[PDB]
Symmetry: D2
Subunit: 292 residues, 4 copies
C-alpha cells in the first residue's frame, strides 16, 4: 500500500500524518512544487515513528518520479476558477505518467468542477475519481446537533448532498439520532438554523483564523474515505461522483451517497427526495455544466 499526497499545506500534511498513524500504508510521499517545506514535514513525521509505534516510510519531495506505482493519490492543490483549473490539469497529467491505475481523490474548489477536470485528464474509469465534500458538511451538521441535544456524535447521522454554499442540499428526512428523525426532537425553524450554519460553515473558521482555512475536520474526512478503500469496508459516504441518469441528472459531477470498496465507487445510492430538494439538486448540477 503506497500513497501520494499533492500539496504540502496544512490540509495535505495533516492528511499524510493521520494516514501513517493509523497504519493505513506501507509507503507514503509528500510532494509539492516549492523546494523545502515538503522534505521538512516528511522527516519530522518519520521521526515520530518510535513514539507512534508505526513503521511507515515517509519522504517529502519535488520529483514526480517518486510517486511511481501509487495505489492512492490525493490532490489538495487549491487556492480563482482559472487558477485552480490549470493546476489540477497539470498535476493530473503528471501523476498519470508514473502510476498505471490509481484512485484519485480531489480536494480543490469549487469542488465539483475540479473533480470533473481531473477525471477527464486522467483517462480513467469514472469509478476511480472522487471528490471529498459530503463527509465534511455532514461532520459539522452532526457536531451542531450534538451541541443542541448533548449526545455522542457517534450516534448521529446527517444527510447532505449537492455542493457547498447555496448549492448544498441537506436532507432532513434522513438525519437522525439513534435512528430517530431530527424533526421529532427540534422545531422546524430551529433546524433551519443549524442548516444555515452548515452552508457558511467553511467561511466561519476563516473569519477567525484571519489567514488560511480549516484543516483538522477536512483532512480527517479524507482519511475516512481512505480507510474504507484500504480496508475494503464498503462504507456508505456522500462524495462528488459522476452521474449518468440517477436523480434525473446525466453527464456531470454531484455529491450523492455511494458505497466505497477496494475498487472505488462500487455502487451509487439513489434516494427519494421531495419536490423542493430534488429540484435544487438538479439546479446545482446545472451551473456545473455551465462552467465545464
Amino acid at each position: 500500500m503506497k500513497i501520494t499526497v499533492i500539496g504540502a499545506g496544512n490540509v495535505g500534511a495533516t492528511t499524510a500524518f493521520r494516514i501513517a498513524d493509523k497504519k493505513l500504508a506501507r509507503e507514503l510521499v509528500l510532494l509539492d512544487v516549492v523546494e523545502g517545506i515538503p522534505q521538512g514535514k516528511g522527516l519530522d513525521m518519520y521521526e515520530t515513528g518510535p513514539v507512534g509505534l508505526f513503521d511507515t516510510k515517509i519522504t517529502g519531495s519535488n520529483d514526480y518520479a517518486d510517486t511511481a506505482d501509487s495505489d492512492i493519490v490525493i490532490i489538495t492543490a487549491g487556492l480563482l476558477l482559472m487558477k485552480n483549473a490549470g493546476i489540477v490539469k497539470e498535476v493530473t497529467d503528471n501523476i498519470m505518467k508514473h502510476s498505471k491505475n490509481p484512485i484519485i481523490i480531489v480536494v480543490s474548489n469549487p469542488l465539483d468542477i475540479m473533480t470533473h477536470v481531473a477525471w477527464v485528464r486522467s483517462g480513467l474509469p469514472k469509478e476511480r475519481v472522487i471528490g471529498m465534500a459530503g463527509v465534511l458538511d455532514a461532520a459539522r451538521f452532526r457536531s451542531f446537533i450534538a451541541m443542541e441535544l448533548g449526545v455522542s456524535m457517534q450516534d448521529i447521522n446527517a444527510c447532505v448532498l449537492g455542493g457547498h454554499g447555496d448549492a448544498m442540499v441537506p436532507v432532513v428526512k434522513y438525519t437522525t439520532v439513534a435512528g430517530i428523525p431530527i424533526s421529532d426532537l427540534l422545531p422546524a425553524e430551529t433546524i433551519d438554523k443549524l442548516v444555515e450554519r452548515t452552508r457558511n460553515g467553511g467561511a466561519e473558521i476563516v473569519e477567525h483564523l484571519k489567514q488560511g482555512s480549516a484543516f483538522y475536520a477536512p483532512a480527517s474526512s479524507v482519511v475516512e474515505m481512505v480507510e474504507s478503500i484500504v480496508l475494503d469496508r464498503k462504507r456508505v459516504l456522500p462524495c462528488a461522483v459522476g452521474l449518468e441518469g440517477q436523480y434525473g441528472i446525466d453527464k456531470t459531477f454531484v455529491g450523492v451517497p455511494v458505497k466505497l470498496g477496494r475498487n472505488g465507487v462500487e455502487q451509487i445510492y439513489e434516494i427519494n427526495l421531495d419536490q423542493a430538494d430534488l429540484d435544487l439538486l438538479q439546479k446545482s448540477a446545472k451551473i456545473v455544466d455551465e462552467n465545464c
Copy 2:
C-alpha cells in the same frame, strides 16, 4: 481529567488534537493571547469528533478563567529561536513569557502537574518550577524523549529493523549539552556497538545533536512539531493511566550524579503523582563529567535573570 494547552501554534494545536483523538481527557482548553486563532482551531478540532469518534469538549480562548481546575497544564508559548536572532535576545523574551504564563494559570489551578516545552528547555523548566510554588516532583520538561526518537529512527535507517525494537539512552540537554549514552542503546537488548561500526555510530550521534536544525533548514520558517507534539503525549499518557514508564526527562536533582538542585535530563519513573523515581545509572567517566559540566553552565543563566 481537564487539560490546558497554552499557545496556538503548530506545536500546541497538534498536541491538543492528538490528546483529544486518543481519548486522554474529557475536557480540553486551547488558549493564546491572539484574537481569533485559538477560537478557530478549537472549533475545527471539535467538528472532527464525528469522524474521529471522540467526545471531548474542546474550547479555544483568550481568557485564562477557562483553565480553572486543570489537572495538567502544558506550556508551549515562546518559540525556539528566530533565525538571525541573538542567544541572549531569546533568553529574555521566553523567560519573561514563561514566568508570566505560569503566573496567570496558578491564579486558577491550585495543584496541577506541569509540563514545559518552552526553549531552552532545562532553563525554562527551572523558571516555571520556582514561579509555581509546587514540589519538584510535579514539574517536568519534555526533551529526552524527542532526541531518543530521532536517534532511534537513524539506527533504524541503518539496520533496517522496527523502531519498536530499539532503545536509545539520552541524558543532558540539547546542543553540546546532550549526553547520548551508547553503551545502553540497543536492538532486542543487544548493544549497537556489537552491530554497527564505531565510525557510523559517531555520525548518528552527531545528527541527533542538530536534529531540530535539520527540520528548520527545510521549513525555512518556524520549527518541527509532529515528533515533539507526540513526545509530549507519551508523557501525558503515563500520567493519566499511571503506567510507570521509565522515561528520560528534565527534573531537579538532589544529589544523584554528583549534581544537586539543578534541572537535568535523566531516567525517571512516570506516574499519576509525577516524578516517582529517579535512576542513577553507571555512566563511564567521560559521560559523567560531561553531564556535570553542562549542569554548572545552566546554573549560570539562572543567575543572570
Copy 3:
C-alpha cells in the same frame, strides 16, 4: 478506576481481558467461588501485558475482600437455562445466587454502578437493584446492544455494507419479549423499508429473536460469549469516558410508555453517572402493546420470589 467481574467462565474472562487490553481500568479483579480457575486465568491475562502494551493490575481470587471500593461491578454468575430445565428451576437457582453475590459486594463497596448480565435478564436486574440499595440510575442490564448487534450483522450480510453504517433499534427483552422497531432501523439514515422487501425483513427479525439458540446449535455444550462480552464493554466505555452514548438497556421506568416501576429495555443516555436520560420514542400502537404486556410478565415472576 477499579473494576470487578464476578464469574470466571467464558463470558467473565473475555470481558475482563477486553477491558485491560483496551485500557479502561487501572485495577481489575476476577472473582469466583471455586479455588483455582480465577487464579490461573487472571495471571495468564497479566502475563499478556508485555505483548498487549498495557499496565493494569490483574488478579483473580476466592475472597470478596479483594473487590473493596470497586467503581464498577459486573455480575456474570447465574448461567442460562440448561437442556433439561424449566423456567421455574432457573429463576430459583439464579435469584438465590444473584442476591448472595450482591449482598457480598455491597459489604465492601459503598457506591458502585452495577451492570447485570445474568438470566433471565430483566428479572435479575430487578433483583440486584433491590438488594443493593442504590438509586436505580446505577443498576442496569445488558441485552439491547447484543440483540441490536446481531440484527445489524444480519442486515449487512444482506446489503453488503459496513456494519458501522447501520442503526438497529431493539426494545423489550429476549425471546418473545423482544420488540425490534423497524421504522427506526436504518442504513446511512435510510429506513430499511425503503431498501428491502417485507419478506426478508421479517426473516432477519426472527433470526434475531432466536439468535443465541443459533449459537448453541453449533457449540452443542455452551452459549455465546465474544459478542456478549463486547456489548458489555461498549457500555463500560460510555460510563468511564463520559461519552453519553444512546443505547438500549434494562432500566427501571416510572411513566414513559405507560409503564411503571418495572425494568424494561429502552433507549437511554449513558454517562459517568449511570442513566442520565430515558427517551420515549413514537412507537406504533402494535409495538407499544407488546411492550406493556411483556412487562407485566416481569411483575408476575418478581412476586413469586
Copy 4:
C-alpha cells in the same frame, strides 16, 4: 489479506479473534475436525463486528476447500505423546498444501521445535516460510515477572530467551534490560535465579491452577505479534523457532533464536554473542531436539 487458523480450542479461537479485532485481515477461516464448534465461535466473532467496529469476513468450517489461497496459516492443533502430535501435524499440513500455493506457516504444538520440523519437511517449502512460536511467550512471562519485581511498565523491559521450553530454555541474563539497563545492576543474583526458575516452569504453573487445560491468552497474543510483523512488514526482531544450517555451531535442527520477520518470513537470522556457559547448553538442547 486472507488468514486461516486450524484448531478451535482456546488458543486458536482467541488467536483468530485478536486478528479480526486488529483489522489485520480481510478474510479469516476457522477450521477444525469436529462439526459445530468452528462455525459457532466464528459466527460469535462476526456478530461482534457492529460493536468492535470492524468488517472482517469470518467463517467456521470443516472442509479444507475454504482455505484456498491463504497467505498465512496457523497450525495450533495438538493435545507416545511425541508420535501422537507428530502425526496430527503431518495430516494437517498435507491438506493445507493441497489448497494453498505459497503461504507462511506458524506451528504451535508440542514439542514445538520437533513439530515445526515435521511441518517443514511435509511442507516442502523453503525453511524461510515455516516457523514456530515459543520464545516470545517465555519472554512475555519473564518481562512480567520482573515488572512485578520493580514496579515498572512492561513496555520498557526487554528479555532474551533462546532454545526450547522447560529444561531446554536458555535465558540470556546479559541481554535482559530495563530501559537499556542490564538487570544484574538492579536485582540480586538470588532474586534473578528465582525469576528464571519461575519462568522455566511457567506453563505448569497455569496448569496446576486451572487443573483442566492450559494457558492461552498470553500464548495467543504472542502469535498475533508475529502475524502483525509479517502483515504490516514492520521488520520486528523476535525469538522464534527456525531451522539452522550452521549458526551457534548447530546444524540441521530447529531451535529458538532471534530473527527478523518481514512479508517473506525469515528475512535474517541473528547469531548473538553468548557466553561459553549458555552456548554449551544451547548445543545440548538441539542435541535431544535432534
